[PDB]
Design a protein around this ligand. Structure first.
Ligand SMILES: *[C@@H]1O[C@H](CO)[C@@H](O[C@@H]2O[C@H](CO)[C@@H](O)[C@H](O)[C@H]2NC(C)=O)[C@H](O)[C@H]1NC(C)=O
Ligand SMILES: *[C@@H]1O[C@H](CO)[C@@H](O[C@@H]2O[C@H](CO)[C@@H](O)[C@H](O)[C@H]2NC(C)=O)[C@H](O)[C@H]1NC(C)=O
Ligand SMILES: *[C@@H]1O[C@H](CO)[C@@H](O[C@@H]2O[C@H](CO)[C@@H](O)[C@H](O)[C@H]2NC(C)=O)[C@H](O)[C@H]1NC(C)=O
Ligand SMILES: *[C@@H]1O[C@H](CO)[C@@H](O)[C@H](O)[C@H]1NC(C)=O
Ligand SMILES: *[C@@H]1O[C@H](CO)[C@@H](O)[C@H](O)[C@H]1NC(C)=O
Ligand SMILES: *[C@@H]1O[C@H](CO)[C@@H](O)[C@H](O)[C@H]1NC(C)=O
Ligand SMILES: *[C@@H]1O[C@H](CO)[C@@H](O)[C@H](O)[C@H]1NC(C)=O
Ligand SMILES: *[C@@H]1O[C@H](CO)[C@@H](O)[C@H](O)[C@H]1NC(C)=O
Ligand SMILES: *[C@@H]1O[C@H](CO)[C@@H](O)[C@H](O)[C@H]1NC(C)=O
Lengths: 242, 237, 198, 50
């Protein structure tokens, strides 16, 4: 039923988006508001295939009434996951601070935990001083370059046919900009590599005798035995990436 | 020793603990390999690029066999079956579709190139600062107090091994901002005053090494009235 | 709106971010810079203030003999901040431009559905119930070709904006790592003057 | 529309990636430390007011 004060000379009704949301009765004198039928998106939450075969279903942006019991979250309706009381690290993110995990074994939804609580004592005249150290080594991985490609418009858009090539001339020069952009990218890749790696003006050589005060650098220096002359870590990195 | 002196630790700390530091470094270098060996997700960034490229190319090829609102996706059949004056429409539709696909691919590659270049610039800056020198910026070259770094190569990327220093085995102590003696205040040159319960010493701020208090380690600079919390104790001359 | 478009909620709520900020504030208040490179070590606040003063080239007796004056100046400077933020109308303009642009793009995308692009009508049902299939195919093809370009343009604009947002996020993360977790010597990186705290 | 090619899956993929990156940005920025420190019950930091 209509709630707005319809002016007694109009028939239809529209909104900011210009969509019909009011129709005058053809047989009586009344206006009816039209609302779209409920719809939403469906998401599937599953662990690895070779660990189980159960799943959970999330209906996005809808209440559970419009559809291991049901559950209502700020992101929508969850079916197939059992709510718990604890809090762990997030395993499969779902929505506003709600995660799901696999743990008999079932699928449990919970609230993620930020971290372990701590409270350092503070006072007006106290200090803490360390008495020992630890040497730590960590890794950082960064991409530097990309694959360099080139294309041919005539061979791609048309095959060996000549009618297609003749008709292609009516489109102007829409096939010379592409080559320019691809060539620019290809040159930029080499520029990136040269900027990153070419930092030394001379090639240095390590002394044949390797005794650096007790330190051992054998795992990072090049290995003469291998034909490629690469360190074991470099060889492992090259083998790991396909 | 020079690198140790660059973070606030004297050289005698290293010179009297050479074997322990060397053993720790060797153990860490030996253990670093298994971290890369397992958890293959670690080299995700170096792999996605490859995958992405392949995917893109595949899609483009798979876009060739599409009707695009025409009778057939093969030029020869369109030419043979329909007379040339009408086949122009179908040929034009196919041309427009393929041109759109090529433009989309080119634009996507152009967008990706900028992110790749930004990553390369960051890597170049890291190589300039962490490797060829020592860095004071926090959490830039590792996690902790930076000592050194080592580069390695990888398919379409670089790997940095950061060697840093971390304190451990802390202990509680009582401190005072200054020391009162003969009506004069004394402040530490470098370090901090610490009391073990009965006596008072002056130490560094990153390694417990107490020393007796002497006018060599302190400067007077003022009187014994303005400062709040000043305690009084004798000073060896 | 809401005829094919959905807005997803962020993974982190508005309270977890506040908890993270409170943890950072407590760590930098009760531990100095030591909590960002190892175990947190306690230290009285005036002593770490003396350390920070020494870090810029001023001896400790300058602070230790001027504690109350510095505390009063800091209190007044902190107090004026709320009035400075409230009085200035367009202070948080950068955070409002994001919302404005994200609303404008969606509004334009929604409004684009009322364009004929060349056809008898811009409504599918009328075309289907009014004409024969041979012409309905042409009309539907025209409408599809009209809408696909709008979708592609929206996607491209979103990608271009996301790149800049990511760059700003990287800058903010670097600033949090450098200015907050420790002192800085880079000029004008953290404020105007000789950096003390953040 | 079915016979217009795979012009829609590659539209969903970009938006999904954008959403993932947007969710990752906040974790990169705020989630630095993994311990939740708390202030002492009594607040007197040498006269400074926080
Ligand atoms: C500082 O830490 C080092 C390393 O943990 C300690 O050296 C260890 O001492 C124990 C006790 O005999 C040995 O079992 C270990 O083998 C030593 N580690 C190494 C790598 O050799 C050292 O004792 C600590 N010093 C202080 C003062 O706490
Ligand atoms: C430096 O480290 C390497 C790597 O561990 C040492 O090489 C090891 O040598 C022992 C001695 O026979 C072998 O049992 C190991 O298998 C070797 N490791 C590897 C990975 O092959 C090398 O000996 C160390 N340098 C010194 C001077 O001891
Ligand atoms: C820190 O500053 C706040 C803000 O001025 C102080 O809170 C004020 O306290 C006085 C005295 O009780 C009240 O009259 C004001 O109304 C308070 N202000 C507000 C905004 O509530 C607080 O007392 C200060 N801290 C200390 C230790 O004095
Ligand atoms: C439950 O669904 C109805 C739809 O009929 C909706 O109006 C209501 O807001 C939903 N409940 C909650 C708590 O959102
Ligand atoms: C915790 O458990 C109680 C039952 O003891 C339940 O009522 C409550 O909803 C649970 N809270 C959460 C957050 O799971
Ligand atoms: C430390 O000294 C100040 C100075 O008055 C005092 O307010 C505070 O309560 C003292 N700390 C404790 C734990 O008593
Ligand atoms: C220092 O004292 C606090 C409380 O007084 C205590 O929790 C902490 O463990 C002490 N530190 C050490 C190294 O024992
Ligand atoms: C404190 O240091 C003095 C200095 O000689 C020493 O005599 C005393 O035994 C020490 N006490 C403790 C508990 O370490
Ligand atoms: C030494 O300090 C104490 C306070 O701890 C004070 O009572 C005493 O008067 C001081 N000594 C002199 C000679 O003033």
């Amino acid at each position: 039923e209509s709630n707005k004060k319809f002016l007694p000379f109009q028939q239809f009704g529209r909104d900011i988006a210009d969509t019909t949301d009011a129709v005058r009765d053809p047989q009586t004198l009344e206006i009816l508001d039209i609302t779209p039928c409920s719809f939403g998106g469906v998401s599937v939450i599953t662990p690895g295939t070779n660990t189980s075969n159960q799943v959970a279903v999330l209906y996005q942006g809808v209440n559970c009434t419009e559809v291991s019991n049901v559950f209502q979250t700020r992101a929508g309706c969850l079916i197939g996951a059992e709510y718990v009381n604890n809090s762990y690290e997030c395993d499969i993110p779902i929505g506003a601070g709600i995660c799901a995990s696999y743990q008999s074994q079932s699928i449990i939804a919970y609230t993620m935990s930020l971290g372990a609580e701590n409270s350092v004592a503070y006072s007006n005249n106290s200090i803490a001083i360390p008495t020992n150290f630890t040497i730590s080594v960590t890794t950082e991985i960064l991409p530097v370059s990309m694959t360099k490609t080139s294309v041919d418009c005539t061979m791609y858009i048309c095959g060996d046919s000549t009618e297609c090539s003749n008709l292609l001339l009516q489109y102007g020069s829409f096939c010379t900009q592409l080559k320019r952009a691809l060539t620019g990218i290809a040159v930029e890749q080499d520029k990136n590599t040269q900027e990153v790696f070419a930092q030394v003006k001379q090639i240095y050589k390590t002394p044949p005798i390797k005794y650096f005060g007790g330190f051992n650098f054998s795992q990072i220096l090049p290995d003469p035995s291998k034909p490629s002359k690469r360190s074991p870590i470099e060889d492992l990195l090259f083998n790991k990436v396909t | 020793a020079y690198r140790f002196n660059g973070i606030g630790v004297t050289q005698n700390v290293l010179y009297e603990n050479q074997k322990l530091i060397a053993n720790q470094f060797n153990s860490a270098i030996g253990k670093i390999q298994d971290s890369l060996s397992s958890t293959p997700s670690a080299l995700g960034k170096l792999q996605d690029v490859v995958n992405h490229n392949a995917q893109a190319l595949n899609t483009l090829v798979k876009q060739l066999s599409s009707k695009f609102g025409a009778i057939s996706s093969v030029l020869n059949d369109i030419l043979s079956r329909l007379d040339p004056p009408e086949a122009e429409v179908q040929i034009d539709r196919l041309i427009t579709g393929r041109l759109q696909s090529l433009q989309t691919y080119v634009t996507q590659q152009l967008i990706r190139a900028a992110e790749i270049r930004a990553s390369a610039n960051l890597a170049a800056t890291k190589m300039s600062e962490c490797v060829l020198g020592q860095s004071k910026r926090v959490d830039f070259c590792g996690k902790g107090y930076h000592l050194m770094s080592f580069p390695q190569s990888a398919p379409h990327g670089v790997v940095f091994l950061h060697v840093t220093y971390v304190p451990a085995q802390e202990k509680n102590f009582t401190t005072a901002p200054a020391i009162c003696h003969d009506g004069k205040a004394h402040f530490p040159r470098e370090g901090v005053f610490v009391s073990n319960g009965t006596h008072w010493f002056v130490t560094q701020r990153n390694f417990y090494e107490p020393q007796i208090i002497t006018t060599d380690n302190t400067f007077v600079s003022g009187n014994c009235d303005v400062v709040i919390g000043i305690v009084n104790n004798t000073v060896y001359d | 709106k809401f005829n094919g478009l959905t807005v997803l909620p962020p993974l982190l709520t508005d309270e977890m971010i506040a908890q993270y900020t409170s943890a950072l504030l407590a760590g930098t208040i009760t531990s100095g810079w030591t909590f960002g490179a190892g175990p947190a070590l306690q230290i009285p606040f005036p002593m770490q203030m003396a350390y920070r003063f020494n870090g810029i080239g001023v001896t400790q007796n300058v602070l230790y003999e001027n504690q109350k004056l510095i505390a009063n100046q800091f209190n007044s400077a902190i107090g004026k901040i709320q009035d400075s933020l409230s009085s200035t109308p367009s202070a948080l303009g950068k955070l409002q431009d994001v919302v404005n642009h994200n609303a404008q793009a969606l509004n334009t995308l929604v409004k684009q559905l009322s364009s004929k692009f060349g056809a008898i009508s811009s409504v599918l049902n009328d075309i289907l119930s009014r004409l024969d299939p041979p012409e309905a195919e042409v009309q539907i093809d025209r409408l599809i070709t009209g809408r696909l370009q709008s979708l592609q343009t929206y996607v491209t604009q979103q990608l271009i904006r996301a790149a800049e947002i990511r760059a700003s996020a990287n800058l903010a993360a670097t600033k949090m790592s450098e200015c907050v977790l420790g002192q800085s010597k880079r000029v004008d990186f953290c404020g105007k003057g000789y950096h003390l705290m953040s």
